Amino acid sequence: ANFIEKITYLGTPAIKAGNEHLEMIVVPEWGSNVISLVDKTTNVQLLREPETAESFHDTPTLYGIPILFPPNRISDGTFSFRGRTYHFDINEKDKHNHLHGFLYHEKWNVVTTKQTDEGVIVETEIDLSELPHVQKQFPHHAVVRMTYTIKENTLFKHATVMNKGKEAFPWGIGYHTTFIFPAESSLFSLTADQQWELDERLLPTGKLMDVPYKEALHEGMDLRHKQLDDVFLSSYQKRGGENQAVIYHQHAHISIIYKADEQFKHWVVYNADGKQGYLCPEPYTWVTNAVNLDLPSSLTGLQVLEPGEETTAKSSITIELN
Ligand SMILES: OC[C@H]1O[C@H](O[C@H]2O[C@H](CO)[C@@H](O)[C@H](O)[C@H]2O)[C@H](O)[C@@H](O)[C@@H]1O
């Protein structure tokens, strides 16, 4: 059995949806952020939720499931594609970067909902051609549609990117998914063997380096004393197997299995100073500053949409009790 229910979340219109296992709340006006995800059998909130509307707007990439299109940093807000130069807003002033794209602070539209014995679906969408300031930076008719499905114990979260315009464009997407993570008693694992060497502006040098603690990382490890803001390379490209981050909550015995498809070639892991009680395992289809790297696309994960084409990038959050 499943349900949809319109609600007000901190004074903004929102949609609660779920079944007997899981319940989400998506907030279309807040960059289509999935702001709440609850495990119903244990009654546990999984995501970092904002105390107030104002605290959300202070840091809208540090709550729920923010959408990063494109993800992370572009040096000087500048890059070229097929001969043409682009200038995105420099919103990270100290490191002189564009950071986190166009969509996490814009209003999306609810395009449909669908309920069957296969689960409950909510779809949201935004058309960048309708955003005049975005068009100044990125004059392309990109349309992004999110399809959220809750079925059994999994939230499926699919992004479909469409080129409805006259020219090709490069694209990447990531999520800044912020889980509650008590440092003392939760464990984290990730399918990664290598990570990208970063400079003081958090920009890749182009070099990869082995993750020294990769065995611990694969198995599940605590993050006490470890401060992360790291760009990991998914091990899937080179080794196969899985592409996923796992969080294990030791008290209620809840496993959160965050899977992503082969397009999600990189994971950024961020836990601030380690004392903020959250963790962001962020799957990205492209590496930070991918647009400015002369490296093969099999590595960077850069993608291009020709006019009239579309691509769906899949990921999912499964909650297991063990
Ligand atoms: O932003 C345009 C420049 O992009 C590249 O350089 C930046 O990105 C590199 C890779 O992350 C950094 O090492 C470098 O420090 C950044 O300045 C490109 O190599 C430059 O030619 C472009 O002007």
From Swiss-Prot:
Pfam families: Aldose_epim
Metabolic or biological pathway, per its Swiss-Prot or TrEMBL entry: Carbohydrate metabolism; hexose metabolism
Gene3D superfamilies the UniProt entry points to: 2.70.98.10
Listed GO biological process terms: galactose catabolic process via UDP-galactose, Leloir pathway; glucose metabolic process
CDD domains, alphabetized: Aldose_epim
Catalytic residues identified in the record: H176, E282
Alphabetized UniProt keyword annotations: Carbohydrate metabolism, Isomerase
GO cellular component, one term: cytoplasm
Positions contributing to substrate binding: N72, R73, D229
InterPro entries documented for this protein: Aldose_1/G6P_1-epimerase (IPR008183), Gal_mutarotase_sf_dom (IPR011013), GH-type_carb-bd (IPR014718)
GO molecular function: aldose 1-epimerase activity; carbohydrate binding
Record-stated family: Belongs to the aldose epimerase family.
Protein name per Swiss-Prot or TrEMBL: Aldose 1-epimerase
Encoding gene, per UniProt annotation: galM
